[PDB]
Amino acid sequence: GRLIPAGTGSDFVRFTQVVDQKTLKAIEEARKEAVEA
Amino acid sequence: QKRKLQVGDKLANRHGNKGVVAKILPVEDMPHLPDGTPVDVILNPLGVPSRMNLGQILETHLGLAGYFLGQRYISPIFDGAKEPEIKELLAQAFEVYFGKRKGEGFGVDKREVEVLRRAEKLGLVTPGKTPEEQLKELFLQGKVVLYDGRTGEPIEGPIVVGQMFIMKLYHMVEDKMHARSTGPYSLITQQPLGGKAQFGGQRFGEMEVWALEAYGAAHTLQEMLTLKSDDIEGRNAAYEAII
Amino acid sequence: RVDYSGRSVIVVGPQLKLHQCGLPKRMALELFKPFLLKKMEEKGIAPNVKAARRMLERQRDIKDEVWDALEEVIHGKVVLLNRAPTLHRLGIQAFQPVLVEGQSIQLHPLVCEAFNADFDGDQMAVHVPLSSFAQAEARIQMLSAHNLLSPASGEPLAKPSRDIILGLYYITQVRKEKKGAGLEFATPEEALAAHERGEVALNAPIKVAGRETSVGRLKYVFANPDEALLAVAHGIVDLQDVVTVRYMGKRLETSPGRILFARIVAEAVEDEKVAWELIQLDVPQEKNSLKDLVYQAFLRLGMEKTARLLDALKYYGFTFSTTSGITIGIDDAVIPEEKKQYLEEADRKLLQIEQAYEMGFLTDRERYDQILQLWTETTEKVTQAVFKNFEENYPFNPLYVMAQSGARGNPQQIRQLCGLRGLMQKPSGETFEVPVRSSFREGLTVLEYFISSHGARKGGADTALRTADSGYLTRKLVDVTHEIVVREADCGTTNYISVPLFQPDEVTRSLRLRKRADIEAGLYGRVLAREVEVLGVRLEEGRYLSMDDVHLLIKAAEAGEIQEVPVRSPLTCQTRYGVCQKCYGYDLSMARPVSIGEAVGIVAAQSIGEPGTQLTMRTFH
Amino acid sequence: LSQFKDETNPLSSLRHKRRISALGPGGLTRERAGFDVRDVHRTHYGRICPVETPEGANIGLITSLAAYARVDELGFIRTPYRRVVGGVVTDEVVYMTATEEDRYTIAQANTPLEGNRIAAERVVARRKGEPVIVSPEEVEFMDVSPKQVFSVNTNLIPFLEHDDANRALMGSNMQTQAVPLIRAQAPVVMTGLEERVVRDSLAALYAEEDGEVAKVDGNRIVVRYEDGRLVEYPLRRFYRSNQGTALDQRPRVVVGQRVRKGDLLADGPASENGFLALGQNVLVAIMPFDGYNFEDAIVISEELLKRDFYTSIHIERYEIEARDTKLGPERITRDIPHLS
Amino acid sequence: MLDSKLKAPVFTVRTQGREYGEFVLEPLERGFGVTLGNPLRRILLSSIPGTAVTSVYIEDVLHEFSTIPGVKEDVVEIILNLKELVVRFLNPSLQTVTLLLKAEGPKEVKARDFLPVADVEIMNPDLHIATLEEGGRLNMEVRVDRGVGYVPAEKHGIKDRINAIPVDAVFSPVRRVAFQVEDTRLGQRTDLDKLTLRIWTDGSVTPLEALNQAVEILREHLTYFSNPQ
Amino acid sequence: MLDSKLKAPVFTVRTQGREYGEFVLEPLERGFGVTLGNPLRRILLSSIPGTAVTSVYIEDVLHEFSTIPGVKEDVVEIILNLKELVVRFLNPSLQTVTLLLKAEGPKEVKARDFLPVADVEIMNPDLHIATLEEGGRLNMEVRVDRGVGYVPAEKHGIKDRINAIPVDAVFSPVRRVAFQVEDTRLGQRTDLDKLTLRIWTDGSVTPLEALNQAVEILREHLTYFSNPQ
Amino acid sequence: AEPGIDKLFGMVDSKYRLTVVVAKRAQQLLRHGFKNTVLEPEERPKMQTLEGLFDDPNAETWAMKELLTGRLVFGENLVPEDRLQKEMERIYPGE
């Protein structure tokens, strides 16, 4: 009753994320904040 | 309860043409004959060549005769009516059809003549004969001119019509479409089960599994194996989640 | 058993587009109950769930506001429809529901071919994609209007079935009527005039065998495209009539209907010129010409744009069919005048075989096998006789065009109505000595019937067997083949197979070009292992050969430049569990390369399990 | 072997009484063996229909006998074959066992007959399962009837002659599923047994002996025979058929009417005038419409519904029990505990 | 007027009773008899209003599937015969008229047996309702309305008396339409259309009336092309 | 107004240029979109009378199948191009107008080259008649008339000059008509007709104008049912 | 069929990838609030009982309608797994 090995359950695509350029600059700002003092 | 005919119902003549009602048309626009009388049912031709029962096409012809001649007949099994005898009664019918038409006061349409043009070019009527004589020929063949009804124009090329007997078939309990959302469940196997008032789920067979397997329907198949039928804790959180 | 399922009788949905399907609101309600409930609460119809529930527990209690809610819930969601035997993946397809009244389920005509589902009561089930994921896949990679080409062959499955062809055909056919006096206009100017007046008279038709132009071409010339049809509308020219017309830059001698079909496509897809490049208006549109059109359109213009053409064809085909007035008549099944000849001729010849036996010349057996040979030939003789009849005298006989057009009719079938069904076998298998002299047009006698009955049962007894046997096969195939899945990077092992374009033995030894089909089967959408320079073009390595390419290689083998073809294949793959892009090829249901993650194993196992139902079944070993 | 009556309509319920099967006692032909039995053996002539049988894994094992087929002394269907001594044909008939049929040269009924004289020198006959063109002098026996070759259910087909035996089956089984319509009509073209079906089946009510009619109720026709007696003939008003189809006997005779012996007093569930009547003759055009009639779809004129043409009465039988639970008897009262 | 306008559609009419009415009109240009006859037909069948039995109440009968003693016909056969009944009221003031009838004993019940109502007339007097034997008690109230088209007894569900039973609505007064376009020769040119349409009517309205209503519905519709947007 | 009358055909229009013009109108009862669209169509094509080249006379040419020196195009190709010519006269006084044109030598003959006529205008100036080389002499008289529908050159047989050749009559500003009747859902009942007809026009008149003329011809014809006889 | 399904198919390396993208985009479109879109102003998603599709009919019909534009970005490993859900909650209101 596990997901099928063949199809959208492909190890090649099971993992794929999506982004908005707005959320792209948001995450890099999180990296900018990493600069201490 | 009264069961008036409807789009879900299936009718079929004694020959074997079986089939379902797909559309109930308003008398307003279905095929109508020269004299205002319109057709009740329109049977597809294509269903006749492949199958091999011209017997129906023979019935409709003798029928056309019985309609205008106001008479019923008895054609035995293999000894019955013969192609010439029918053409003979059709001949008698042409007079009741078109004879009254002569006396009632009118002749032939632009339409009636037009379809004749296309009919001679076809090869159904001996070129050079008068429309009156031509229509007799064309009628004897078992077809008559028909106008659209929706446009009032004619249907290029004679079409046969006639009195065919058709029965209506009994609706089995399965007919009653079974649509189930959520319902009982078997005690030992935890798969959906119906009975009295809850419809009972449909079976997802291997042949059907593969169908999904072939597609990239990963989740859609998991669902069919989990959320929809056996995942006890799944279907529960499933419903509520949907809710 | 699935939790969100349903099942009811199906019914043809002519206006419906491939995209959608008619679903009974009554069913949709139960199906999408929970989706509705919540939607009730978002609107004023109900305070809460439990409320929304009791609000629907009885039929008389539904406010017309609920339908509007459900119709809103179903906006862009889609469902799955299944058929009785799910033989291949197209056995389940997704469509957008268009809620409708009553009990029946409205199905599109075009996909009635994928599901072997006719309308004599066949019922189809229906399931619901609940996750946004399942819905995503369902409508992306499972939707009907997307999966147009078969996984078995790169041939379309969205082919205009029976009624559409019949329509589209009748519109594009040309007619020929009476040849009496001279047919020579190619040369004299007194020929134009004389046979123009002669035609006005009663001797020359508008469609006469007169090489260059039958007077039907002489009389009418149409400037712009439209001009043509207007004359048709006014009753000047029938659609099947031979006329001349001015198109983009050519004076083209083509019929009205043909010119109209041209537009239908030209309109479906507005690249008018691209519409002309992929169409053959030089012939009546058979299912094959159409099939072809579809394919071409798919490769050329793009998937959805094809879909449009599909429905466009479906629509006019349907319409034009109604007006054509093609019908089945008893006098339409025409028996040849030659039937009596062929019969009697073969009749007397039987008498000779008998006299030859009465004397002691031919053995008990010789007689038997000699008689059957007599009829086997005679019967085939009447067959080509009836067709020749229709072919020469009645081009537009009902029973004929249907069979010619990819529509409906089997040569062998026609023979049983017009000519005669001749030889039926005894119970065991030894064919009967006497034939069935009759056709279906005339009384199949009392006994020639009982005789034919035997062979009927065997066909039926067999059908009952492949129903569960065709499965016998597919089971096996899927048990072995399931694990096979496309998961890759171009497998680096280049071990390849060479496809033969030539076969050594039909007649002992003579080298001949393989059938245009078998070859297609071999190299269509394959990946060249090594480079091949053939007629002038350089097929590069690894390139996927399109049907157009596999049409080149054959034209080349015709010329004599290649006898084999280097190509990647599953038989030589390196990926243990799995097959790769370059080794599988093209054919996803789509015509581009295969997409990683396709479950080939089954796709394969299936294409093989279904046709198997058509293969004979006497004894396994 | 004992089954629910097939009362979808008298016809159907009748055949169901004359259907023969394979499977059963287990001791005889069970599930395994098949194709030799399932096939229509030569001898099945006038003894078993070759069209009749079902469609599926269970094929040919279950089939109803033929028209003139009769079980003689021990279950051996003997089909009737009339005698023809020399070139002379008789009106005498011999119900022949399967076996004896082979010892003779038998001819078909289609043979041009002047009465007792055969009319064509080379006329068809079939010795033993083999089609043979025999002479008038060899014709020992002749086929009794074109009807005996098949079953009742099949005999009802108009021009069976021009229809593929394969699809003729469909037609035969289709009638078995015919539902009685409040408005019944006989075919515009019939074969000749419609009358005999309704009469031999027990649809319509026939007059015993000659007389006159006394009262014509909607529930009873008390006729008065000339013998000085009068009997009340109740009419199953509205009864429930096993499969839910109406069975009503509608009186066709008016008050005070001299009846011939054996004439319809009332019509059966599906009879118009003593004639079998299912479905209803309808004028029909045979052309293509948009797609409304595409593979096997039928377009219908609303006008057919205006008139109560295709309309049928149904009746389901819902049933509930008051059970005794250890928790307390289940009472049946107007009391519905929670809301309205 | 004298030339092209005097040469105008000669509207001729031939009508016997309120059922049949022939209507000829010629000359007409090219292919117009069809242009006109067809739409009018489409209207004459769908668009025009009439009368039909909308509900029935036998006094001792509760459901539609019952049988009354002393009464040969069954409730369903009778309610059926009523659909056959054609009535005609004279003015809008009559929307729903309840016709009453009660007959007993050895008499045949025809439609003439209904007690007369002031503004309503029954064109179907001799129609056969039932055959009563002896001790035959039939007392009923049959509703009648003015509507359009076909309305299933299920769609309306009329409620005069709780034990009453609705009936199907056969409202088109027009039974059948029929038009012929035969050539007519007027001097100069032969191609001429002569349109003659034959209309049949249940009696409620007349062929002429019907036709007039018809053409207006068309006219009214042709006006709906006024305000662009 | 509010209920049945406010629920009225919403006449919506979409027109770009004088050639194309879509026209939507809904709701409509049962099967009316058809009842309306069809007649309008039949009118829009035949009735909106128009103009078309009815006859031609090249001065040295005798038959239609000839070729003129210095003239690339053949008589048949040119008489064909003339059918393409769209003219427009302003009043009834102009029934048959003969347009004249004569051009010589290395010039291209376009429709603007025809000598202007007082009450007549040529909307098709740049249309291409012929390509004259050198010593190219083309002097012709092309007739023009006001008629309706399609009239084969054989049917009329015009006779201005004995060596002249008749042409087929393309009498209509309307190029093509097209109507669709798709379902529309209005609250209660779903069965609804939505009629939308697309009209194309050569430019002489506009889709809207045409449509208006059309409906009137119908209206005018519906009045012809006035005086019985 | 569906809008530029071809165009879509072309924007991915694998057919089955496009399905995962659209699906996951539709997920986020709803969860973090449905205004998490990149193309709402002038010509956008629309339904007709009113023009009300602008709020919440079909999730992915949006996802697709955006992916067809070149504003979104789908990668194998574009933005670290858990930090994404954090920044998305921080910036998109509607709950």
Ligand SMILES: CO[C@H]1/C=C/O[C@@]2(C)Oc3c(C)c(O)c4c(c3C2=O)C2=NC3(CCN(CC(C)C)CC3)NC2=C(NC(=O)/C(C)=C\C=C\[C@H](C)[C@H](O)[C@@H](C)[C@@H](O)[C@@H](C)[C@H](OC(C)=O)[C@@H]1C)C4=O
């Ligand atoms: C002795 O009562 C039962 C024995 C079963 O056991 C089996 C193992 O022995 C059988 C024997 C000895 C038979 O002669 C038949 C069948 C079976 C069995 O299956 C059939 N079986 C089927 C084949 C396919 N299945 C579907 C299954 C796969 C899920 C449905 C039935 N049809 C069957 C028949 N039909 C026909 O001839 C046809 C072509 C039409 C007639 C139809 C009417 C409508 C029926 O006659 C109805 C009035 C009723 O009689 C039956 C429904 C009955 O049920 C009851 C409760 O009475 C069974 C016959 C049979 O003549």
Ligand SMILES: [Mg+2]
């Ligand atoms: Mg996932």
Ligand SMILES: [Mg+2]
């Ligand atoms: Mg993101």
Ligand SMILES: [Mg+2]
């Ligand atoms: Mg900071």
Ligand SMILES: [Mg+2]
């Ligand atoms: Mg610092």
Ligand SMILES: [Mg+2]
């Ligand atoms: Mg700092």
Ligand SMILES: [Mg+2]
């Ligand atoms: Mg019902």
Ligand SMILES: [Mg+2]
């Ligand atoms: Mg009449």
Ligand SMILES: [Mg+2]
């Ligand atoms: Mg009559």
Ligand SMILES: [Mg+2]
């Ligand atoms: Mg008989």
Ligand SMILES: [Mg+2]
């Ligand atoms: Mg005669």
Ligand SMILES: [Mg+2]
């Ligand atoms: Mg007379």
Ligand SMILES: [Mg+2]
């Ligand atoms: Mg008359």
Ligand SMILES: [Mg+2]
């Ligand atoms: Mg007269």
Ligand SMILES: [Mg+2]
């Ligand atoms: Mg033709």
Ligand SMILES: [Mg+2]
């Ligand atoms: Mg003649």
